[PDB]
C-alpha cells in the first residue's frame, strides 16, 4: 500500500539509493513514478542538468496545484551513485517513467536529445505513458 508514506511532499522526492529501491524498484506498487536522474552539485558544473531541473520543477508544481497514482522524484548522482551504476548511466540528465507493473519500456525513457526538456514536452510524454494529462502552468 505504501502510498500514505508517499506523502511526503516537497513536490519532488529527493531520493537516495535506499529510497529509490523502496519506492520504485520494490513491489507492491499501484502508482507510476517519474524520475529525473541529475547531477546538480556545483563542482559538477552540469548546466544542462540545472536548466532541465528548472523545467522539471515547473512540471511537478503544476501537478501539485491540480491533482494518487503519479509522483515526481529525482536522483542526484552524488546522492544515488549506486543507482546510476545499476542502470548503467554514464551521463545526465535523464528522465524515466517507472510503471507500477514490470520494467520500464523503451518509451519509458524520455527522448531528451530529440525533444528538449520543455515542461510541456515532458507532460506530453507522461500523458503518452500514463494517460495522466498535466496542464503546465507558466511555460
UniProtKB/Swiss-Prot annotation:
Locations listed in the record: Endoplasmic reticulum membrane
Q: Which GO terms describe its biological process?
A: cognition; magnesium ion transport; protein N-linked glycosylation; protein N-linked glycosylation via asparagine; transmembrane transport
Q: Which residues lie on this side of the membrane: Lumenal?
A: 1-138
Tissue-specificity statement: Expressed in most non-lymphoid cells and tissues examined, including prostate, lung, liver, colon, heart, kidney and pancreas.
**One GO term of the cellular component aspect?**
endoplasmic reticulum membrane
| GO molecular-function terms, A-Z | magnesium ion transmembrane transporter activity
Disulfide pairings: 46-49
Record's keyword annotation contains Calcium: no
Q: Which keywords label this protein? A: Disulfide bond, Endoplasmic reticulum, Intellectual disability, Magnesium, Membrane, Signal, Transmembrane, Transmembrane helix, Transport
Carries keyword Transferase? no
Q: What is its main location?
A: endoplasmic reticulum
Similarity field: Belongs to the OST3/OST6 family.
Subunit details = Accessory component of the STT3B-containing form of the oligosaccharyltransferase (OST) complex. OST exists in two different complex forms which contain common core subunits RPN1, RPN2, OST48, OST4, DAD1 and TMEM258, either STT3A or STT3B as catalytic subunits, and form-specific accessory subunits. OST can form stable complexes with the Sec61 complex or with both the Sec61 and TRAP complexes. The association of TUSC3 or MAGT1 with the STT3B-containing complex seems to be mutually exclusvice.
Disease cited in the entry: Intellectual developmental disorder, autosomal recessive 7: A disorder characterized by significantly below average general intellectual functioning associated with impairments in adaptive behavior and manifested during the developmental period.
Protein name (Swiss-Prot/TrEMBL): Dolichyl-diphosphooligosaccharide--protein glycosyltransferase subunit TUSC3
Annotated source species: Homo sapiens
Gene that encodes it? TUSC3
Which residues of the parent chain are present? 54 to 194 of 348
Amino acid at each position: 500500500e505504501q502510498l500514505m508514506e508517499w506523502s511526503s511532499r516537497r513536490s519532488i522526492f529527493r531520493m537516495n539509493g535506499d529510497k529509490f529501491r523502496k519506492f520504485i524498484k520494490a513491489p507492491p506498487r499501484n502508482y507510476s513514478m517519474i524520475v529525473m536522474f541529475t547531477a546538480l552539485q556545483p563542482q559538477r558544473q552540469c548546466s544542462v542538468c540545472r536548466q532541465a531541473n528548472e523545467e522539471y520543477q515547473i512540471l511537478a508544481n503544476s501537478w501539485r496545484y491540480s491533482s494518487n497514482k503519479l509522483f515526481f522524484s529525482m536522483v542526484d548522482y552524488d546522492e544515488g551513485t549506486d543507482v546510476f551504476q545499476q542502470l548503467n548511466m554514464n551521463s545526465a540528465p535523464t528522465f524515466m517513467h517507472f510503471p507500477p507493473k514490470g520494467r520500464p519500456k523503451r518509451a519509458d525513457t524520455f527522448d531528451l536529445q530529440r525533444i528538449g526538456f520543455a515542461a510541456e514536452q515532458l507532460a506530453k510524454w507522461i500523458a503518452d505513458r500514463t494517460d495522466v494529462h498535466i496542464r503546465v502552468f507558466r511555460l
